[PDB]
Ligand binder design. Structure first.
Ligand SMILES: *[C@@H]1O[C@H](CO)[C@@H](O)[C@H](O)[C@H]1NC(C)=O
Length: 34
């Protein structure tokens, strides 16, 4: 869906999950894959 560089990421201290683009530095909660 969204580009290569997005990867799954997790908020320590509450356990929430999101995605992070380690190629651009962006963050989004909807998943470019799943
Ligand atoms: C969990 O913490 C992050 C920041 O660490 C925050 O952005 C996120 O909204 C929190 N989870 C929920 C369900 O709000």
């Amino acid at each position: 869906k969204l580009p290569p560089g997005w990867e799954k990421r997790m908020f320590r201290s509450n356990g929430t999950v999101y995605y992070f683009n380690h190629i651009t530095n962006a963050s989004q909660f909807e998943r470019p894959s799943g």
